């Protein structure tokens, strides 16, 4: 109706009274308390108000000579950052969702449950037909030595029945090695210093 047109214009400007400056805007944390429906509602309140204000600003700009400047301009600023803050909050929530989604999706992928032709995938060991063997060794062995020694004797292939051989140090002994070599460097430093300090007195 015409009542819809009145919201574009300023009420107290319409009655010629001075527009008052509002107390402030929606801060971030106040919006953090709000749910999504509330957020988009006050978004639309801010939208209607902002449109109203823009129309007013342009009207005063339109007749500069007669009207002067726009009374209580500081509202625009307020309302703008209000909207900005809403965006902020929403962004945050979205990215949270996104993160969560991602880690779900990927753990689906590593389960490998998707197949283009609609249906279940084949069961997880049906295809593998391989067996891994864990060996402990006191010393280090070159892997080719292990490959000739543990290779199938009946298989005639250059691999001799061995798909691959991988050597590792457990992380316990690895940590042991780095700790020990730190102590070794400090040791060399200390014996060097002992020799260097007491060289002169001796």
């Amino acid at each position: 109706s015409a009542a819809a047109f009145y919201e574009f214009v300023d009420n107290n400007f319409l009655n010629n009274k001075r527009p008052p400056v509002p107390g402030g805007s929606w801060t971030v944390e106040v919006l953090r308390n709000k749910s999504l429906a509330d957020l988009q509602h006050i978004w639309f309140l801010l939208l209607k108000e902002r449109n109203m204000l823009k129309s007013m600003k342009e009207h005063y700009l339109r007749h500069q000579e007669e009207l002067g400047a726009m009374p209580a301009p500081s509202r625009l600023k307020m309302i703008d950052e209000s909207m900005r803050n809403i965006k902020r909050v929403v962004k945050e929530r979205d990215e949270e969702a996104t993160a969560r989604a991602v880690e779900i999706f990927k753990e689906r992928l590593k389960r490998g449950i998707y197949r283009y032709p609609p249906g279940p995938p084949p069961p997880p060991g049906a295809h593998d037909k391989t067996s891994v063997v864990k060996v402990e060794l006191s010393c280090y062995v070159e892997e080719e030595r292990l490959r000739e020694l543990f290779g199938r004797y009946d298989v005639f292939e250059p691999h001799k029945g061995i798909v691959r051989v991988e050597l590792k140090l457990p992380d316990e002994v690895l940590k042991q090695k780095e700790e020990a070599e730190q102590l070794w460097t400090q040791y060399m430093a200390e014996c060097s210093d002992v020799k260097a300090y007491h060289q002169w007195s001796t």
């Binding site: 700009l61 400047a69 500081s74 962004k91």
Partner: protein, 48 residues
């Protein structure tokens, strides 16, 4: 020691999150076009 040259603008939240920096920049820019505060122009070339 500065992580940006002294003459750069500060565009960021008070927390330091750069999440909104493009909105902030856009805002500052539309604001440099037509400042909301702006009083009567004394120029002969006037927007209306």
């Amino acid at each position: 020691q500065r992580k940006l040259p002294k003459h750069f603008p500060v565009v960021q939240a008070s927390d330091g999150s750069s999440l909104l920096r493009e909105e902030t920049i856009a805002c500052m820019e539309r604001e440099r076009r037509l400042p909301h505060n702006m009083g009567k122009l004394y120029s002969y070339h006037r927007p209306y």
